[PDB]
């Protein structure tokens, strides 16, 4: 039955995206400089998330610290310690009230900033890899036991469970309509899920290794994934196939983080070669280099107004580019 | 106005964090690892999700983490232990059927990209069973190289031949390719493993500090 699916996806293909970009104005050279530099962490910074107001951000380090930074004045607002030293993810609530963290301890911790531990969620058997806020009442998590989950914070119990993957899930991203979300795992496959029903709508298989990053388009109808085979791939939910690919012959390192810009024109990817690359989303050609870190970049974020891009690496420094 | 209250809260944060830098630099992190048949749980009881053990020797505190709560796959979270001082690898030396899995795990640890600068202290546990098993299998049906081997012990020197053959099999792949390997012989009961870990960590930190002070 898979051969019929492959034949249908071949029959739905008319022409490539790169051949349709003949008559379009190119972006040109993009140069960005480090504006601010945040330096207060001890061990390696592992994840971050930008706020809704595009001013306050949160950073999680591997020594057991979670620090809220002001991007304008470089001021440390809060510095919350952790029960477990090993964490892998953090998220920031859209209303600005709550913050979340998780890691090797198999617990999702939710802190209130109105600073004490407001909620502890404990239902998983593998390490937490990503977490996001739909509202200040429901939370979506992905674990290392091939399961995603949607929880209610007030009851503190799991409401829905998504079990479709064979390898460990590494990243998830919600839609701007807050009704669908995609998840990428360690089986070279990305899946689209609906939060109301709880069933896998569609499955895409394009990569060759573990997928480390995934994020939606601003439109909400496409997404790009980065993996360990030094390639980035853009899929579309309507064409049901691998729409575009971005790769270079001089790179042999994986992709750690993937984000878009405000208009969807640019695509920023952090690599394990101590640098970040800035690709064009339609011409499929490399156009920018951001190199300022002495270790591998591990987390990337783009503001909700498209005014700043913040990177964080294993050199315990978080930097802001404009 | 409002900027003065932000600067006052900032200076309280950078003070206490500095005190944290006084203690995080004063302790050393070790990663204990092994197999289910290996007696790694008997080791951590003597100095005493994720199990933790704190022990102090020569007024130096060590915090060592016995980790397991996950599946069989370990190729993703093993990147978390990049800044550890040492990896304590425990091998059950009385089971030759499971020894090849231990050697392959040692190869995958030693040739990893993010673990290419972290040294390994190797323990070969359960040797009373090795003596009572060799004196009473034949340790050559699984390895067809024991029949031609010379040693580089109360009544028979065959146990010395077996022990040095196993540690030479472990050391050949270590010396085939920054970071060292420190093998020791340990028994079921032993109250000197903390001293061995202390001395090996002392040698590791001394060899690391010989380079940062520009003395080669």
């Amino acid at each position, epitope marked *: 039955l*898979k051969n019929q699916i492959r034949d249908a996806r071949k029959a739905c293909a008319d022409a490539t995206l790169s051949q349709i970009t003949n008559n379009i104005d190119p972006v040109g050279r993009i140069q960005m400089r480090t504006r601010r530099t945040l330096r207060g962490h001890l061990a390696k910074i592992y994840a971050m998330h930008w706020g809704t107001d595009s001013r306050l951000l949160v950073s999680a380090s591997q020594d057991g610290k979670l620090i809220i930074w002001d991007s304008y004045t470089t001021n440390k607002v809060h510095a919350i310690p952790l029960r477990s030293s090993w964490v892998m993810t953090c998220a920031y609530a859209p209303s600005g009230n709550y913050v979340a963290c998780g890691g090797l301890d198999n617990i999702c911790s939710i802190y209130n900033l109105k600073v004490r531990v407001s909620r502890e969620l404990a239902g998983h058997t593998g390490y937490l890899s990503c977490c996001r806020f739909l509202d200040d009442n429901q939370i979506v998590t992905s674990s290392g036991d091939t399961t995603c989950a949607l929880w209610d914070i007030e009851t503190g119990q799991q409401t829905t469970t998504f079990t479709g993957h064979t390898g460990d899930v590494m990243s998830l991203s919600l839609a701007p309509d807050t009704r669908l979300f995609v998840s990428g795992a360690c089986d070279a496959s990305a899946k689209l899920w609906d939060v109301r029903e709880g069933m896998c709508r569609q499955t895409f298989t394009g990569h*060759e290794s573990d997928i480390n990053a995934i994020c939606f388009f601003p439109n909400g109808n496409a997404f790009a994934t980065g993996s360990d085979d030094a390639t980035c791939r853009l899929f579309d939910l309507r064409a049901d196939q691998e729409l575009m690919t971005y790769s270079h012959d001089n790179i042999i390192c994986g992709i750690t983080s993937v984000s878009f810009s405000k208009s969807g024109r640019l695509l920023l990817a952090g690599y394990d070669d101590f640098n970040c690359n800035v690709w064009d989303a339609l011409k499929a050609d490399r156009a920018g280099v951001l190199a300022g870190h002495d270790n591998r970049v591990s987390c990337l974020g783009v503001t909700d107004d498209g005014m700043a891009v913040a990177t964080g690496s294993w050199d315990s420094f978080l930097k802001i580019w404009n | 106005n409002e900027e003065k209250a932000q600067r006052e809260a900032n200076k309280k944060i950078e003070k206490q964090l500095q005190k944290d830098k006084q203690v995080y630099r004063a302790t050393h992190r070790l990663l204990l690892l092994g197999a289910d048949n290996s007696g790694k749980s008997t080791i951590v009881k003597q100095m005493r999700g994720i199990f933790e053990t704190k022990f102090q020797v020569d007024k130096v505190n060590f915090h060592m983490f016995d980790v397991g709560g996950q599946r069989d*796959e370990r190729r993703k979270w093993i990147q978390c232990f990049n800044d550890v001082t040492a990896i304590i690898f425990v091998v059950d030396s009385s089971d030759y059927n499971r020894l*090849q899995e231990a050697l392959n795990l040692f190869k995958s640890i030693w040739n990893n*990209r993010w673990l290419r600068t972290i040294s390994v202290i190797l323990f070969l546990n359960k040797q009373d069973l090795l003596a009572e098993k060799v004196l009473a299998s034949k340790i050559e*049906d699984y*390895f*067809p190289e024991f029949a031609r081997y010379t040693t580089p012990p109360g009544e028979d020197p065959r146990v010395t031949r077996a022990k040095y053959f196993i540690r030479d099999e472990f050391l050949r792949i270590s010396t085939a390719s920054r970071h060292y390997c420190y093998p020791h012989f340990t028994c079921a009961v032993d109250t000197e493993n903390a001293r061995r870990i202390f001395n090996d960590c002392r040698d590791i930190i001394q060899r690391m500090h010989l380079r940062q002070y520009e003395l080669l």
Partner: nanobody
Amino acid sequence: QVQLQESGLRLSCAASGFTFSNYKMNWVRQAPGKGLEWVSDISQSGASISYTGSVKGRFTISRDNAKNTLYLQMNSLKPEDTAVYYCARCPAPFTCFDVTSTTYAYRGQGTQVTV
């Protein structure tokens, strides 16, 4: 999608969906009633070839990157060799831990050999 198909006494493993000239390949057996055991492995160019000590001098492994296939030649059989055989790929190129795992996503269904 990555696809590994076994056939087979010369056992053949055919690969599709990925570039065969970048990954180190393994042959892993599974006895009835026993766990997974590592048998043999071959590097990207075939210069480095290693076996388990129980099969050394009795098995042989080869790879053909022109047609992207992996052959195993095995002779002088014993009753202990009755097992299910899988060809496995360790994940990261240019290097690779979990080829001996209960649920691994980069190996085929295997073939039964009964002596």
